[PDB]
Design a protein around this ligand. Structure first.
Ligand SMILES: [Zn+2]
Ligand SMILES: [Zn+2]
Lengths: 92, 56, 118, 143, 49, 69, 56, 186
RNA sequence: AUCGAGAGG
DNA sequence: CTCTCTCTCGCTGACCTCTCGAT
DNA sequence: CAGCGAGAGAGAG
């Protein structure tokens, strides 16, 4: 259908990407303090929108809970430990 | 505390406003020549120090 | 500088001085054609080049999403839609002077107040 | 600083000026080679104004160098002093006129007294050292 | 070397959307460069967007 | 609703579909499958022919496309 | 970053993280912090190797 | 596809940034000494110096690129015909000229083509490479970086098993040929 | 034995 | 000439512990 | 990778 496209890094240099699909819709106040500060994208045109930010992370990083709230080196250590951690590898 | 958090965000915002004003002055080229360093180097050092002071 | 190659053999012309009437003419070695030189300067060398502060500005360059959009406008276009880039030339001494191109004038307007050249 | 010299911002500026290496390559905006058949009459109008200034008291090809005002302002060097250093290196092989420092545009013109002129221009930009300790590229003032 | 490259790139993008042009093949145009690079090469990582 | 734009919670479903078709080892399987289907036959065909020349004479050996059990 | 517009010298583009660890890093902030941590780990390993040789 | 040989072409701009007489010479893969770019262009058949500079430089106006080219143009003014430029190549006569043409088709820009009649495209690509070299020398554009993931390629299991299989298949093919050569009895 | 890989601090 | 740099071009070095899998 | 150990390679008296 062409709703989605595959981009290489060289093609990525020429494109402009938005993390959140809510960035594109028009934005014509009170805010909860706990929510992290987001800089306005302030960009007219985006060629593409990232499907979800969490996809840049790996499988082990996808395991890690709230790594955005965590410091990154601890995330790396936990990825290695998670490879080391015991688990039922398969049902068979 | 919420009050201290508002002061925190205000401090960060003031640092950002100062950084943007310095950047505008760089764009206007109405920036004093600093001996022994490129003018871009001076801009980078000033912005970096601004952010460091904001965090501290 | 203007570089001239002779038309007959398409090889570079070399400077030559006529002493009796004291003028410079370009003579080519691959073929005997000799001509009068319009420009006084044989060779120039810029230690500091502003050349390339704007490189490859096209009409299509006004459409690319990666390029930023500014509020300011040139007096000639009188249209705000513009593209501002920092100097393409990579130098130890580089000015963070914004160079803007708007499509309707197709004229480059430069943020710096000091220089209005070109 | 020398003993008994404190808060000598001025003297420290002069020391910095004396120690930093300064080259003709550093000060020159642009090197240009014109061919001017007549010593009295040049095609460039600014050079003609310099010629009419030179009413006091060879090769026709000439090298014209444009040097940056801001560099001269930062440096201890003056355009007359720069031309003097060029003359000292040339030992009257070549003759130099300097546009006045008061003039808004400053042209330094050198006529040999075109391969020789080109190689001499390169030799002059790279090899001419003016008011500077050799190995020091930069000096800054601090307390 | 091609003239009017934007129209050709528009057509190429429509073909890739159709799938007539393979989605893996990468087509990159830079206007300053005046350069269009097409890479059918294997082994380049791509992300879906 | 088919006209209305998506949200992030909707984007997770597209992520789901992508993961279902590709799997998490899609690259390994794709490279191997392309190697078996096409690369193997091309490799066999390149430099395939063996030619022995006698002065009197010439024997040629070529290779049909490769079949994988 | 591919999300950032060209020729941006703002601290958010250059990697200044306004948010605290409690509020959470943005994706761009997280990637830049990951770059920093990567340099930290590489430098740590190199420092250990160099200092072992130096001590010997 | 087929045999893959990595080929490295080196274009070098001799002389320091302050030094005079900057010359561009490119070394051929099979030739001990770098030959001037203009000599290579003459060997290619693009004989006029203006044509060579037009291949190298896409825009006629800029003086700096032409000025940098002028020392090389002087170097190539000594050899003004294709036959001599092909002749002065490598170490070892007419066989050298023919081997020079063979080296030009197989070793210079091997990816674009390996056969004759394609010299103009190769010369234009070579001039493009000189143009990029000059853009970096002029400091208008900064040097390309090695650590760019788009330039990096991540070879998977399949292609590596493919090259291993090519090597093994070549050994087996050779062995079959040895068996046939060994015996006419079968 | 060797080599290789991986992992721990 | 000619020792005197002086600008090239070779090479040799760079904490323990525990699996395992191949030879 | 650098230095130090050499050797070409002038070299500026
Ligand atoms: Zn001619
Ligand atoms: Zn305008």
């Amino acid at each position: 259908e062409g709703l989605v496209e595959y981009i290489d890094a060289e093609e990525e240099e020429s494109i402009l990407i938005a993390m959140q699909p809510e960035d594109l819709e028009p934005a014509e106040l009170d805010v909860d303090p706990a929510k992290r500060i987001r800089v306005s994208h302030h960009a007219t045109t985006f060629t593409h929108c990232e499907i979800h930010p969490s996809m840049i992370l790996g499988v082990a990083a996808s395991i890690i809970p709230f790594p955005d709230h965590n410091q990154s080196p601890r995330n790396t250590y936990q990825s290695a430990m998670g490879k080391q951690a015991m688990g039922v590898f398969l049902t068979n | 505390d919420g009050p201290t958090m508002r002061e925190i965000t205000e401090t960060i915002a003031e640092a950002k406003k100062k950084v943007l004003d310095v950047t505008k002055e760089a764009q206007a080229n109405l920036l004093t020549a600093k001996h022994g360093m490129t003018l871009r180097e001076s801009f980078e050092d000033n912005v970096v120090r601004f952010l460091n002071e904001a965090r501290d | 500088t203007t570089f001239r190659f002779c038309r007959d053999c398409n090889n570079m012309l070399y400077p030559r001085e006529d002493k009796e009437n004291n003028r410079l003419l370009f003579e080519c070695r691959t073929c005997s054609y000799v001509e009068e030189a319009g420009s006084p300067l044989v060779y120039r060398h810029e230690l500091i080049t502003n050349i390339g502060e704007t490189a490859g500005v096209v009409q299509d360059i006004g459409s690319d999403p990666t390029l930023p959009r500014s509020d300011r406008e040139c007096p000639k276009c009188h249209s705000r839609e513009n593209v501002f880039f920092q100097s393409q030339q990579r130098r130890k001494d580089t000015s963070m002077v914004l160079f803007f191109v708007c499509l309707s004038c197709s004229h480059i307007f430069t943020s710096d107040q000091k220089n209005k050249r070109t | 600083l020398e003993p008994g010299h404190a808060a000598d911002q001025e003297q420290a500026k002069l020391i910095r000026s004396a120690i930093e290496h300064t080259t003709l390559k550093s000060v020159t905006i642009a090197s240009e080679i014109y061919y001017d058949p007549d010593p009295r009459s040049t095609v460039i109008p600014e050079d003609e104004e310099i010629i009419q200034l030179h009413f006091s008291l060879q090769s026709p090809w000439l090298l014209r160098l444009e040097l940056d005002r801001a560099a001269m302002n930062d440096k201890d060097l003056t355009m007359g002093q720069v031309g003097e250093r060029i003359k000292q290196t040339f030992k009257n092989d070549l003759f130099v006129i300097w546009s006045e420092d008061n003039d808004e545009k400053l042209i330094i013109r050198c006529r040999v007294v075109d391969h020789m002129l080109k190689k001499i221009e390169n030799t002059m930009l790279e090899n001419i050292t003016l008011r500077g300790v050799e190995n020091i590229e930069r000096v800054v003032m601090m307390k | 070397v091609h003239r009017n490259p934007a129209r050709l790139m528009e057509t190429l993008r429509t073909l890739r959307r159709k799938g007539d042009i393979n989605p893996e093949v990468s087509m990159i145009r830079d206007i300053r460069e005046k350069e269009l690079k097409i890479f059918t090469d294997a082994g380049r990582v791509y992300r879906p967007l | 609703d088919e006209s209305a734009p998506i949200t992030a919670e909707d984007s997770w479903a597209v992520i789901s579909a992508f993961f279902r078709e590709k799997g998490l080892v899609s690259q390994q399987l794709d490279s191997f499958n392309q190697f078996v289907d096409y690369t193997l036959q091309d490799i066999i065909c390149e430099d395939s022919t063996l030619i022995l020349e006698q002065l009197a004479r010439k024997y040629e050996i070529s290779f049909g496309k490769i079949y994988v059990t | 970053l591919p999300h950032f517009s060209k020729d941006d010298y703002s601290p958010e583009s250059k990697g200044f993280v306004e948010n605290s660890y409690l509020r959470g890093l943005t994706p761009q902030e997280f990637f830049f912090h990951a770059m920093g941590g990567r340099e930290g780990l590489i430098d740590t390993a190199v420092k250990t190797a160099e200092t072992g040789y130096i001590q010997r | 596809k087929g045999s893959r040989f990595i080929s490295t072409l080196q274009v070098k701009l001799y002389g320091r940034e302050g030094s005079s007489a900057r010359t561009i010479k490119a070394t051929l893969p099979y030739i001990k000494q770098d030959i001037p770019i203009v000599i290579i262009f003459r060997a290619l058949g693009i004989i006029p110096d203006g044509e060579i500079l037009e291949h190298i430089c896409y825009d006629v106006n800029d003086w700096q690129m032409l000025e940098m080219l002028k020392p090389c143009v002087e170097d190539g003014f000594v050899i003004q015909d294709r036959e001599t430029a092909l002749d002065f190549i490598g170490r070892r006569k007419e066989k050298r000229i023919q081997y020079a043409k063979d080296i030009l088709q197989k070793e210079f820009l091997p990816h674009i083509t390996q056969l004759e009649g394609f010299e103009s495209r190769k010369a234009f690509f070579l001039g493009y490479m000189i143009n990029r070299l000059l853009l970096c020398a002029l400091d208008r554009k900064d040097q390309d970086d090695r650590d760019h993931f788009g330039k990096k390629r991540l070879d998977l299991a399949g292609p590596l098993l493919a090259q291993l299989f090519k090597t093994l298949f070549k050994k087996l093919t050779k062995d079959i040929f040895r068996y046939m050569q060994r015996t006419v009895e079968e």
